[PDB]
Design a protein around this motif. Sequence first.
Motif, PDB file in Angstrom:
ATOM      1  N   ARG A  44       0.452  -1.028  -0.237  1.00 30.11           N
ATOM      2  CA  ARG A  44       0.026   0.084  -0.205  1.00 30.11           C
ATOM      3  C   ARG A  44       0.896   1.005   0.369  1.00 30.11           C
ATOM      4  NH1 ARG A  44      -2.916  -3.895  -0.865  1.00 30.11           N
ATOM      5  NH2 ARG A  44      -2.726  -2.871  -3.032  1.00 30.11           N
ATOM      6  N   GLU A  47       2.074   1.557  -3.517  1.00 35.58           N
ATOM      7  CA  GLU A  47       0.676   1.635  -4.367  1.00 35.58           C
ATOM      8  C   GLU A  47       0.786   3.522  -3.866  1.00 35.58           C
ATOM      9  OE1 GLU A  47      -3.268   0.721  -3.849  1.00 35.58           O
ATOM     10  OE2 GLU A  47      -3.524  -0.560  -4.988  1.00 35.58           O
ATOM     11  N   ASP A  62       9.653  -0.609 -13.522  1.00 36.26           N
ATOM     12  CA  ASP A  62       8.765  -2.340 -13.930  1.00 36.26           C
ATOM     13  C   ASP A  62       7.654  -2.027 -13.565  1.00 36.26           C
ATOM     14  OD1 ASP A  62       7.796  -4.451 -12.861  1.00 36.26           O
ATOM     15  OD2 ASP A  62       9.840  -5.644 -13.568  1.00 36.26           O
ATOM     16  N   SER A  63       6.319  -2.285 -14.093  1.00 33.72           N
ATOM     17  CA  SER A  63       5.140  -2.551 -13.944  1.00 33.72           C
ATOM     18  C   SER A  63       4.025  -1.284 -13.419  1.00 33.72           C
ATOM     19  CB  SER A  63       4.574  -3.666 -12.388  1.00 33.72           C
ATOM     20  OG  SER A  63       4.789  -4.995 -13.172  1.00 33.72           O
ATOM     21  N   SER A 102       1.646  -7.702  -0.457  1.00 33.16           N
ATOM     22  CA  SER A 102       0.945  -7.979  -0.695  1.00 33.16           C
ATOM     23  C   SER A 102       0.754  -8.233  -2.449  1.00 33.16           C
ATOM     24  CB  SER A 102      -0.563  -6.637  -0.528  1.00 33.16           C
ATOM     25  OG  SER A 102      -1.072  -6.918   0.686  1.00 33.16           O
ATOM     26  N   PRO A 103       1.659  -9.599  -2.297  1.00 35.50           N
ATOM     27  CA  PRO A 103       0.944  -9.485  -4.007  1.00 35.50           C
ATOM     28  C   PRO A 103      -0.472  -9.609  -4.877  1.00 35.50           C
ATOM     29  CG  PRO A 103       2.297 -11.346  -3.154  1.00 35.50           C
ATOM     30  CD  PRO A 103       2.012 -10.552  -1.605  1.00 35.50           C
ATOM     31  N   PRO A 104      -0.103  -8.732  -6.019  1.00 39.18           N
ATOM     32  CA  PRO A 104      -1.578  -9.257  -6.683  1.00 39.18           C
ATOM     33  C   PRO A 104      -1.560 -10.906  -7.246  1.00 39.18           C
ATOM     34  CG  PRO A 104       0.384  -8.294  -7.629  1.00 39.18           C
ATOM     35  CD  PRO A 104       0.685  -7.400  -6.447  1.00 39.18           C
ATOM     36  N   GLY A 105      -2.368 -11.459  -7.237  1.00 37.23           N
ATOM     37  CA  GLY A 105      -2.436 -13.091  -7.096  1.00 37.23           C
ATOM     38  C   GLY A 105      -2.056 -14.229  -6.761  1.00 37.23           C
ATOM     39  N   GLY A 106      -1.233 -12.989  -5.396  1.00 40.83           N
ATOM     40  CA  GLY A 106      -0.266 -13.959  -4.939  1.00 40.83           C
ATOM     41  C   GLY A 106       1.311 -14.741  -5.391  1.00 40.83           C
ATOM     42  N   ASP A 107       1.459 -13.861  -6.245  1.00 39.30           N
ATOM     43  CA  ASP A 107       2.436 -14.189  -7.522  1.00 39.30           C
ATOM     44  C   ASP A 107       3.600 -14.158  -6.963  1.00 39.30           C
ATOM     45  OD1 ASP A 107       4.271 -14.032  -9.801  1.00 39.30           O
ATOM     46  OD2 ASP A 107       2.935 -14.128 -11.108  1.00 39.30           O
ATOM     47  N   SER A 109       5.923 -12.128  -7.577  1.00 46.03           N
ATOM     48  CA  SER A 109       7.099 -11.609  -8.448  1.00 46.03           C
ATOM     49  C   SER A 109       7.231 -10.641  -9.316  1.00 46.03           C
ATOM     50  CB  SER A 109       6.595 -12.716 -10.457  1.00 46.03           C
ATOM     51  OG  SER A 109       6.742 -13.479  -9.988  1.00 46.03           O
ATOM     52  N   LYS A 128      -1.646 -19.920  -0.483  1.00 47.03           N
ATOM     53  CA  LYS A 128      -2.863 -19.388  -0.569  1.00 47.03           C
ATOM     54  C   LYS A 128      -3.706 -20.594  -0.281  1.00 47.03           C
ATOM     55  CE  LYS A 128      -6.712 -17.445  -0.915  1.00 47.03           C
ATOM     56  NZ  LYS A 128      -7.541 -16.834   0.048  1.00 47.03           N
ATOM     57  N   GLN A 132      -6.402 -21.611   1.627  1.00 46.41           N
ATOM     58  CA  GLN A 132      -8.072 -22.471   1.648  1.00 46.41           C
ATOM     59  C   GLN A 132      -8.232 -23.932   1.872  1.00 46.41           C
ATOM     60  OE1 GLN A 132      -7.617 -23.009  -3.234  1.00 46.41           O
ATOM     61  NE2 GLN A 132      -8.096 -21.455  -2.820  1.00 46.41           N
TER      62      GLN A 132
END
Lengths: 154, 600, 459, 459, 49
Positions: A44, A47, A62-63, A102-107, A109, A128, A132
Motif C-alpha cells: 500500500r 502503491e 517495472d510494472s 500484498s502481491p497481486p494474485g499471490g504471485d 513476482s 494460498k 484454503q
Amino acid sequence: ALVANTSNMPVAAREASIYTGITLSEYFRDMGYHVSMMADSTSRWAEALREISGRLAEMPADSGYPAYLGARLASFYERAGRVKCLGNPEREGSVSIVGAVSPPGGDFSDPVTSATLGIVQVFWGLDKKLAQRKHFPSVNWLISYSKYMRALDE
Amino acid sequence: TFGYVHGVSGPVVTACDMAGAAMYELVRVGHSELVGEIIRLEGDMATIQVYEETSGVSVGDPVLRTGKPLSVELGPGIMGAIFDGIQRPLSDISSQTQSIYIPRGVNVSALSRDIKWEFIPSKNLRVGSHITGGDIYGIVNENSLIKHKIMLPPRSRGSVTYIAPPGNYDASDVVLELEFEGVKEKLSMVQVWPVRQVRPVTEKLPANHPLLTGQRVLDALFPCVQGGTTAIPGAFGCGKTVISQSLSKYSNSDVIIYVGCGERGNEMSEVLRDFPELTMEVDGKVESIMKRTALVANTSNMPVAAREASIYTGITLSEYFRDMGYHVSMMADSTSRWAEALREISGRLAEMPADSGYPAYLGARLASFYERAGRVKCLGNPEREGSVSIVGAVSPPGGDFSDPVTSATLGIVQVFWGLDKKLAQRKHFPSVNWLISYSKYMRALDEYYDKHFTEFVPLRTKAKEILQEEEDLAEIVQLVGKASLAETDKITLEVAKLIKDDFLQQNGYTPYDRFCPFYKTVGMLSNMISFYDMARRAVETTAQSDNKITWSIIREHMGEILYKLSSMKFKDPVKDGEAKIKADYAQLLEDMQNAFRSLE
Amino acid sequence: YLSQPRLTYKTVSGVNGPLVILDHVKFPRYAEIVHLTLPDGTKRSGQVLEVSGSKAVVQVFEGTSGIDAKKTSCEFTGDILRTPVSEDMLGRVFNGSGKPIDRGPVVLAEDFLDIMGQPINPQCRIYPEEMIQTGISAIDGMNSIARGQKIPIFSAAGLPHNEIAAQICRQAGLVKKENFAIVFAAMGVNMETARFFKSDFEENGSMDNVCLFLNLANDPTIERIITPRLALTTAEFLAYQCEKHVLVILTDMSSYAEALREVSAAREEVPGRRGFPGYMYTDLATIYERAGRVEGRNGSITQIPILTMPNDDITHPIPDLTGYITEGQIYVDRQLHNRQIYPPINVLPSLSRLMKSAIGEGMTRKDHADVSNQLYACYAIGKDVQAMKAVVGEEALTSDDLLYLEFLQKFEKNFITQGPYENRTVYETLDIGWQLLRIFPKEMLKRIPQSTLSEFYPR
Amino acid sequence: YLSQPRLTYKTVSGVNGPLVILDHVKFPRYAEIVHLTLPDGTKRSGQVLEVSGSKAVVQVFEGTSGIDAKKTSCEFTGDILRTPVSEDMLGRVFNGSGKPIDRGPVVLAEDFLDIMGQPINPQCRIYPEEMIQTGISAIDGMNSIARGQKIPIFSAAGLPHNEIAAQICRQAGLVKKENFAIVFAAMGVNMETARFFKSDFEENGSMDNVCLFLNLANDPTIERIITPRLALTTAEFLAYQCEKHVLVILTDMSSYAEALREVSAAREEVPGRRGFPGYMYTDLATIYERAGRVEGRNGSITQIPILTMPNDDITHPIPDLTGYITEGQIYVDRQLHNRQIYPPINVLPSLSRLMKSAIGEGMTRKDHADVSNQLYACYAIGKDVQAMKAVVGEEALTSDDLLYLEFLQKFEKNFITQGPYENRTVYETLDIGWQLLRIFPKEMLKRIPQSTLSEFYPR
Amino acid sequence: SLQTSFVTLDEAIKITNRRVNAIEHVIIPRIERTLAYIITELDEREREE
C-alpha cells in the motif's frame, strides 16, 4: 502504540504513516527498549508512490512502479537493527521490522515482493493453497528461509 | 458551412476555421468529399478521422460541415437494398456508375429521390389536430408483404398544419407540416436518426412469444423468444447456413435484417448471391425474401469506421421497423470481426489497450448493443407493439472461448446455439452440440407453453434427461460392450439414438421437411417420450423374476412400432393437414399402448 | 451556504475523449460540478478532475457526443457533488445519477451530503460483534456473516448470483434466539436483472424498506462510478444519522471496475494490471470501507459487493483487489452449478474474516468453531481424493480415502444443497455438520478437541 | 492532365533520419511524390507523409545521407504515385518502384492508376467457380484453388517456399477441359533468390505470361510497401479491363509486414500488438481483397500470398492476421522437407474452403470430389497405423492396417513427391490418385459412392 | 500360460492407463496453466511499454 492510515484515507498519507511508525520505533530504541514494529502492508505504501508518480508524470519502471521504489524500501528496512545507543548512559536497544507485502494474485513476482526479498533477511512465504485448507498459519515451509539460523545456534 | 484543411498526418486530417463543430459530427473533407468524423477539438481547429484514403488531400482544401452525427436515413426504399456499414446503397453505386469499384468520396443518397411512392394518409388526422412523437400519419405501399408506416420522428410534436392528400410523392417532398410554439417543421417521408442513439419506446416488455424457427432442434430443446438475444458460433464447418436460411425463410418474424461486419469478399458474395434467390410461400404465392429483408454488406477491406459502424447501422434499421409494430430479426454475421474493427480503431487512436489487446470498453459496447433488443411497447397513439431479436454469430481466432469477445458475448446472450464441426463430418445436421448449447428463456415461455400446448414442458425435460444419460452411459458402454448393462439403460441408449436420428436431425433439402410446424415437433417428441416411458415400465414391472421383458424382446415384439415412430418425420405439412397429422399420431399412441399391453 | 450568483461560461477550449477543457475560468475549484447545455437544449453534467491557472478539465457524465466548442454553455455550481438525502427515499426508485424514475417527485432533502463521504475515525469505529442469520448453511455454518461485515459474492457470468442475493434479502435475520433497510445499486445490468430484483422486493412484501438505484447497460458508463457512492451516501444517512440497520448490495462490481478503467485510459493514468488504474485499490476502498458499526450509535451498514469474475480467473484484479479489502467472500463456481446444486457456493476458497469472533458461547453454540474447522478439513481432503482417484482409479483407494469420498458426496447434497426457499437455522446447520462429521471415527477428527467430541459426537 | 509548371523548393527546415522536413511549401498534398537533387547532382525520390500547414514532411525513398539544408532542391510533381499500366508490360520484369530492370524500355502507358486503388463493390462480386490448376498434384487433387479464391502458403524459414512459387509460375494454367497471366511480386528478396526467379522464368519460356516485380532485401523499404500495390494495380488492369484471368503470387508477405512496421515507426506511431501497427489488419485486407470475380466481365484475380512463420509459430500476428481473412491454407511442413520430399506440403493441416466449387462435372471430372475425400481419409489413417506400428510392431498388424501402411508409403512417394519439372495436370493427378486407391478393395473405400467406383475403380 | 501372460498384461494395462490418466489429469493441465500464465504476463509487459 499504533498508527491508523486506513485504505479509505488519503493515499499520500500512506508514506507518512510508514515513516512515522519507524521514527517512533527508533525513539524508543534510543531509550534502551527492544522495539518490534510491524507495518501490515508495504504494498500500500509502494502503491501510494505509484499513484503519486503517475500524477507527477514521471517515467515509470517495472510494472508502473517508480524507479526509486528500491531506494525507498532499502532505506526503510535498514533502520532496523540491534544498536549501541548514543548517550553517556550506554543503553542497548533494537528495532525489528516485520513487514507484510500484498502481491497481486499471490504471485511473488511483483516489484515490491521482489525488491523486498532482496532486502529482508527472513522470508516467511505464505501459500494460498494452505489457507484454503485452513492450515494456519499458511506457511509454505519450502520457499521460506531465515539467514539468522547460524546466528542463533549459539 | 465550410472550413479548411490545415494538415494531414495520414488518415487523420487537421482542420482550421472550424469553430462551429460538435464532437462526433460529420465532415466531408476535400474536393472528393471524403467521409470522416471530428474527434478532438481545440480552439477553432478540429481533428478529423477520415474513413477513406486521404491521398491527394491538400492544405487549404474545403471541409463541409454536416450538422448531424453518424446517422441512418430512414424512410421508404430501405427494403430490398444492400447498404454499406455507413448507409451507402451498394446496388445504386454499382448501377449509377457502371463501375465495379465504390468511388472514393462517393455521395449517393441512402434512399433514392426519384421514386414516386404510393402514400395514403391515415385518414384520421385533420389540420388542427394534436400529434406526438411516434405517431403514424400515413402508410407507403412498397410491396405485397411489408407496409412502410410513416412515423413522426422522435423528439417532435405539435399541431398539424398541413396533410398531403392521397397521391404519389417522392422522398424529397413535404408530406406533413406541424407547428410547435409557433415553429413550423416541414417533414418528408425520410427521417434521420443518429446511429449511436437508442430510439425511445413507451416501455420495455418481457419476451414471452416464441421465435418459431423451422428446426426441431434449436426449438424443442433450446427455445428462442421474440425480442431475445442468442449467439451462434461461426466456423467453416458448422453449417451456419441452415440457421441463416431457416430464420429468414420460415420465421414468424415480419422483417429480416442481415448485417455483415467485415467478412471475406467471397463470403459476402455468397450471402449477396444466395439471399436474392430465397423465396417463401406467404398467401399461397411464392415471394422473394428480398421484399421483406434488408441487408448491410461490409467486407474486410471496407473502411474500418464502416465495419465498426455496421453493427449499429443494422440495429438502427431494426429499431426503425420495431417502432412500426413489426417483429424484426437481425443476424450479425460475425460480431468477432466487428470487435476486430473496434480494436483497430482503438489502436489508430493510440488508446490504452486492455484484455488481449481489446479496448477497455469492449464489454460496455457489447452490453449496450444487446440491451437494445427486446419486446417493447411502441411510441405513438396507435398503441402498437413489436420486438427486435438478435442472433449474432461469434468467430474468435482459433475457435477458443477465452477471447474476451466470445466470453463477453456469452455473458450477455441468454441463448447459445452451440454448433459443432464433428457432427457435420458425421453428416448430422443441423450440427447442434447439445451438451454445450443452452437456453435461459425456458421459464419465460412457460406461460405460453402451458396455455397452448400443455405437454411440451415435461417432454423437453425428459428429452434432455434421456440425451444426457446417453452421454453419462458412454463410459459404461465403452468398458462393457452393452453386455453387463441394465435393460433400462439399453432403452435409454437406443431411444436416445432414435431421438438423435428421427427428431433432432432434420433434412432441409427435402420438400416435406423444409419446415416443421411446432404442433408436429411436439407430436413427434410426445410419441417418442411416451414410448420411452412404456418401455421403461414394461421392463421395470416385469424385472423381478421368472418372466421378464428385455429390450431385445421389445424390438422383436413390436418392430412395426419402432418403424412407425421413425416414419413420423415424413408427414408433409403441405399435403397432410394439422388434423390428419394429429390423427395419425394418435393412432401410433394407440398402437404402442396396445403393443406393450400384450406383454403383460 | 452559497449566496453568490453562479457564473456561466462559453469558453470551452477543446474536447478530448470524455474530457471537456475550459479556459478563462475564474478561480477554478477542484472537484466541483459543472452543468452544461448543448446547442440543442440537452443538459449534461460533469466534474472538474483538474485545475491549472485559468483552465479546468470537466469529465462529462452523460458523454461528450454533441458537445460544441462555440455554443456550449457551462455553469459552475461552486461546490462538490452534494446530493439531497432524506429518510423517505426508502420506497423510491432512482437512476444511476440519483434522479427519480418512479414518476414521483424529486427528493425533498433533509440535508445535503458530500458524495465522496468522509473516512470514519478508527478510534470511534466499533468492532462488529453481531451475527446475521442468512439461512444458508453454506454461509451461516462455515462462513458466518456479521452485521457491519463486508462480504461480496464472487461469481461468474451465467451463475445464479442474482438469485442468491435476492434470497439473502428476504431470509436474512438474527441468531438472537428486526427489519433491514435494503439499498440495491443495479449498475451495468440488463432490464431483466433489474426487473427481477424489483419484482422480488415487491414479492417479498418489503418494498417499503427498499431504495433502488438503477444504471442499466444502455446508460452512460461514467455515471456508473458515482452510483455506488449515491447508494452508500443514502446508507450512511440512514445508518449513522437515523440509526437504521442498512444492507447495501452493489451489483456486478466488475461494471464499476470497467467504467473506472475507461476513465483511467481516457486520462492516460499509470496502469497496474490488465489495464486498470494503479490507484484502483484506493478507489475501491473509498467504496467498500463505507461500512461497519460506529460506537455510540445503534445503526450499521452491511455490504455485499457482488462481482463477476472475468473468465473465472480468481486472480483477476477485480476479485483480487476486492479480496484484499473485504472481510472474505462467498464465491460460487460452475462445478456446483453444472450439477444443479443450489446455492452453488464453494466453501473451500472462501472465508469470513470476522467469523472467529461472531460465533461461539453467547453468539450461537460453543461447538460452532470446531464444527466449521473440521468440515473444512474433511471437504478439502475429499477434493484431494478425487484428484488422486481420477488417475489411480477407485480400486487404488483404501478405507481412509473412501471415508472422505463418502463425506464429500453427502456433504454437498445434505449441507450445501438447500433450494431458493429453504431457510435453515444456524443451530440446525451445526447439527447437520455433526451428521456429516459422524461419518468419520473420533481419531480422524483432528481439528476438534476431545472436550467437544465427547459431548456432541456420541449423538 | 494538369499542365501546371512544377515548383522546386530549396527551403529545408531540417532532416531527421529517413525524413526531410521542408518549409514554405505551397498547398502541399499528402502522398505527393517529389524528387530531390543533391549538391552532387544525385537525384532521389520521396513521398510526402505529413503536411502541417506550410511544413511538408517528405520521406526519401533512398537513404538521406548527403542531404543538406541549404542547397538540396525538392521538385514537386503536383500529383500522387500513379503507375503506368498496359498489356505490354506482361513479359517484363520491374523493380519495386515500377522501373524496368530487364534492359527494356520504360513502359509506354495505356493508362495511369492510383496504386492504392478502390475497394471492389461487394454488390457486384461473383462467388468463385471454375478451377485454376497449378500442375502440382499435392494442391490440385487435394486442395485445389478455385478461380477467385485467396489461399496463402505458410512456410517456415529455410523451407523451399520460393522454389514452389517458381514452379507454380512455370506450370500454372487453366484446366483446358491465351487468356491467363501471372503477376508475381517478391518483397524483401535477396540477390541470390532474385536471380533464381528471373533466370528460371526466362529460361523455361514462361515469361510471356508473367509480370515480375522484384523488391530486393537491400532496396528501399518504402518501395517494398508499394511493390504489392503495383502488382495488384497491374492485376486489376489486366484482369478487369482486358478480360483475362490473372494469378497473383505475393512472396514473403512477412517481409512486407516488417517494412510496414518501419513505416509506422517513421511516422512516430506507438507500436501495437507484438510491435506491429494497429492497422496491420486493414492494411493486409486492403491488399488481399483486391481480387475475385466481378459481375458482367470474364476476368478474375486469384492470390496465393506466401508467408514465413516467425519461429514457426502459426499464432504469430503475421500468419494469424493473414489466415483470419483468407479462405483456407496450403501449409508447407518441415518434416517432409527433412525427409527429402518435394514438394514438402502436408495435406492433413491444409484446407481449401472453395474446393467444393472449384471441382466437379463441367469443371474438372466427375470423380474429383470423391477421390480427394477418400485419399485424405486414407492418408490420415495410414499415419495413424504408422504410429501404431511404432508401438506394436509389424507382426501385430492386420491386413487392413498393412494396406493403409502400403498406401502411406506409396502415396507420399508417387502422389505427393513430384519434382520441380514434372507438370501434372488435374486429370493425371486424379488418375494417379486412383492408382493409389486401387490398393484397397471396393469395400474399404467408404467415402466414394458405388456409382463412382463402378465407373472409375477398375482398370 | 494364458493365465501368466494375462496377469502380466493386467498389471501392464493398469500401469499404462495410470500413466495416461496422469498425463491428462496432472501433467497437461499444469502445462496449459503455465502457458496461459506466460501469455498473460507477456501481454502485461507489452502494456507498460
